[PDB]
């Protein structure tokens with residue numbers, strides 16, 4: 001199938017019409033998404049088949065065809081771009097300065113941008129265009145608005 | 157059965173729409189990978 005680097009929509013026909021359940025990143029021949037999007041199911045790329053290789057429900061991450069490749073980190077200071085890919089709509093950069101998820105195991109980047117759940121898997125970039133993590137695992141706050149972690153995996 | 161379609165390049169776009177705030181949030185992460193507000 002198509003193994004050009006870039007961002008891709010994750011679609012299903014198991015419901016009415018063709019439905020976008022999420023987004024993902026192709027890099028170095030590996031496809032990267034969020035576990036809650038695919039549930040670790042295989043994927044089609046034309047005639048090509050993509051088999052899961054690594055995943056973890058707690059990180060809510062999954063890689064296809066190879067190990068996790070994305071190792072760039074939010075620097076803790078600079079603004080970032082959410083390369084959002086919403087259902088039925090074209091790819092759109094949105095610049096923001098991330099907030100902070102404070103946890104017992106450490107502090108994580110967070111972006112306060114609200115988009116349909118089908119946007120889950122859209123990447124977040126540094127000023128050099130490197131992927132520092134994926135969008136779509138987070139929390140609903142006092143206001144009723146959505147805040148997402150900058151979810152990054154470990155490269156071996 | 158699920159399939160992928162390409163939707164763009166991964167590029168920093170100068171003078172993109174600038175928006176969103178920057179909250180500091182106390183959160184817990186459970187074994188199911190669901191975040192929650194530690195209040």
Ligand SMILES: Cc1cc(CO)c2cccc(CC(=O)N3CC[C@@H](N)C3)c2n1
Nearest residue numbers: 036115116117120136137138146189190
């Ligand atoms: C309720 C809601 C609302 C919005 C936006 O208003 C979302 C935006 C992106 C992604 C998700 C999905 C999400 O955060 N999780 C699913 C799996 C679990 N671990 C968290 C969203 N979930």
